[PDB]
Design a protein around this ligand. Structure first.
Ligand SMILES: C/C(=C\CC/C(C)=C/COP(=O)(O)OP(=O)(O)O)CCC=C(CF)CF
Ligand SMILES: [Mg+2]
Ligand SMILES: [Mg+2]
Length: 280
């Protein structure tokens, strides 16, 4: 991974305060659950996904990482084997994208709503709409996976449940910038984002050893290498991509920040954290 390792300089305060938010929302209810959470290194992961963020902006990234893993745990048992009970939970969470939740919504849904509320404030309406669609793709991916439990086939599903795109979206919010929306939709940026998704699920399946079960580990390492080389090839096209879409000066700087603080960080930060996390 020829990308520099980076960590937010406010990482120590973020890690020390990380429990206050999931506790106040009823996501962590026992001291043993709290310690199990601390052992995940989730604020550490957030500070490497979002090295450009400090303060409340970094706190939002920590809460998203905290929420991601508390949410995914709810599908390890029988619920994940049943698409009807999986969809019943996802529908209650995704409902936060469309309006206020009823007080009777489960705590994990109130937690997502508090993150989504903070995610959208101060972003353009079109950014929020697109980021909401990414979330729905993620929730629908859980329903599809539970249906399959009850390579190309695995990717088309794992590319949504891996949760990379909502992680990248938050880097924009945490950095208070938006990549030009017509460049987000560009074929070149779409290929860059797909590499970031694929490298994340490949690295995870190896650290979680699933693509291996589906020589195999060696072939997956070569695919990570091939895609990282193509990623750099695609980065070198961005100057000409910017000209094709007639980006002005502020738009070129937002594209540059998207490249370095959102796409590169989700690739590199995942690699560093997988090597020193307590989940593995
Ligand atoms: C890109 C993100 C994290 C880095 C990649 C990771 C850890 C993905 C999580 O892989 P999983 O197989 O679902 O569980 P595991 O950690 O292996 O026991 C944020 C999204 C994380 C999720 C899992 F909590 C998505 F639900
Ligand atoms: Mg899990
Ligand atoms: Mg895994």
């Amino acid at each position: 991974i020829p990308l520099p390792g980076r960590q937010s300089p406010d990482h120590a305060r973020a890690e020390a305060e990380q429990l206050a938010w999931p506790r106040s929302l009823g996501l962590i209810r026992s001291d043993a659950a709290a310690e199990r959470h601390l052992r995940g290194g989730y604020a550490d992961l957030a500070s490497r996904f979002y090295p450009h963020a400090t303060g409340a902006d970094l706190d939002l990234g920590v809460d998203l990482m905290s929420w991601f893993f508390l949410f995914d745990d709810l599908f390890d048992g029988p619920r994940g084997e049943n698409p009807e009970d999986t969809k019943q939970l996802t529908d209650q969470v995704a409902a936060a994208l469309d309006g206020p939740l009823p007080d009777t919504a489960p705590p994990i849904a109130h937690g997502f709503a508090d993150i989504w509320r903070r995610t959208c404030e101060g972003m353009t309406p079109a950014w929020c709409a697109r980021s909401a669609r990414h979330w729905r793709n993620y929730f629908d991916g859980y329903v599809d996976e539970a249906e399959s439990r009850f390579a190309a086939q695995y990717l088309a599903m794992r590319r949504h449940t891996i949760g990379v795109q909502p992680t990248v979206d938050l880097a924009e919010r945490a950095g208070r910038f938006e990549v030009p929306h017509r460049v987000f939709d560009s074929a070149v940026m779409s290929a860059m984002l797909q590499i970031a998704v694929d490298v994340n699920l490949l690295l995870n399946d190896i650290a979680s050893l699933n693509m291996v079960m589906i020589r195999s580990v060696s072939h997956m390492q070569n695919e990570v290498r091939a895609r990282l080389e193509q990623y750099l090839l695609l980065e070198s096209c961005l100057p000409k991509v910017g000209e094709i879409y007639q980006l002005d000066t502020a738009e070129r700087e937002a594209l540059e920040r998207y490249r370095t603080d959102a796409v590169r960080t989700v690739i590199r930060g995942s690699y560093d954290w997988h090597r020193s996390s307590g989940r593995y």
